[PDB]
Amino acid sequence: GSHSMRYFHTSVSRPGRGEPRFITVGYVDDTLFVRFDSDAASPREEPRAPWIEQEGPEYWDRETQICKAKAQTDREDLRTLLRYYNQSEAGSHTLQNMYGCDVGPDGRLLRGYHQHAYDGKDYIALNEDLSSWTAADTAAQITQRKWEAARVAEQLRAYLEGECVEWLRRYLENGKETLQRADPPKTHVTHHPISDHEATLRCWALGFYPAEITLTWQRDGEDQTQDTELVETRPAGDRTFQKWAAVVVPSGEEQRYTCHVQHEGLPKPLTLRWEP
């Protein structure tokens, strides 16, 4: 199908309590495969999926080296950002960076990404052209100027079109047993009396991978968007995910309501109703 690889990084400064903590995780689709935490007793890139374990010592050495260096660079950047925003050295601040690539069924690049946030706000992002920059404010424009001067975008593009897609394809092949298997949702509807006058119908989706899914309630074939409580998709802890959607329904009206489920693990979309 279509697939992604993403690396996430967060550094959080903590003045008075040592250097900023650096945590990074790597993902293919919704499967974590690597991690690194600077507060670990012996910090190193660590495996988190079975198919990445077969990579040799040279792999783990290279990735660990990169992580260790990125930790130091983030710390310099955090100091830079205090200057750009005229901020004091007493407060805690946050630098986030995501990059990675999307590929289609034939494994060709669909889209690359490389973007930063500071204190929870967009700072600078590589545009979809992988050649120009979007800076959120005048501080970020100083970064943009430096990155244009040094032709940084060209370097990122080369990684994003080359190594990002080539290694993602490698990982997809090596983990084909899990990464290229969609687990369909186990679905049912429950009924939860509120009063004499109404009850809740809750449509469940359980045990599904990947996380992307559509759950909706209709009444007389009309979407109940504004009256549906839809919880955030949540991890079960066994690689799969869970979600539910609930509507408040007048007594005796239950059979007017249908729940609709779309997941890539399902050949056709599902229609469910309350079955007493």
Partner: protein
């Protein structure tokens, strides 16, 4: 500074069956900054050796974490998740409901 208060869901890995081993999850999401404190509770008391996932974030930059522990639900044992964040004036407690 911008601040986003966590969403909190507490739930089991598998549909609850009394006397059957399972996992209790507390999933915190949508928050910033990243500093957060999470306890799982059994009858109002803190559970030891609760594990968690490594800090990650969504496309809008807000953070998410899963706290989790093995547990064997029963009829009377009450479970909860207690969360503290800079956006909360008091710790927020969310009770485990097996129908949610």
């Amino acid at each position: 500074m911008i601040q986003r208060t966590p969403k909190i869901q507490v739930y089991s890995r598998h549909p609850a069956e009394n006397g059957k081993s399972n996992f209790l999850n507390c999933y915190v999401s949508g928050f910033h900054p990243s500093d957060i404190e999470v306890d799982l509770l059994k009858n109002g008391e803190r559970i030891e050796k609760v594990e968690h996932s490594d800090l990650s974030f969504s496309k809008d930059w807000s953070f998410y974490l899963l706290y989790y522990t093995e547990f064997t639900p029963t009829e009377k044992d009450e479970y909860a998740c207690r969360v503290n964040h800079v956006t909360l004036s008091q710790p927020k407690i969310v009770k485990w409901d097996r129908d949610m």
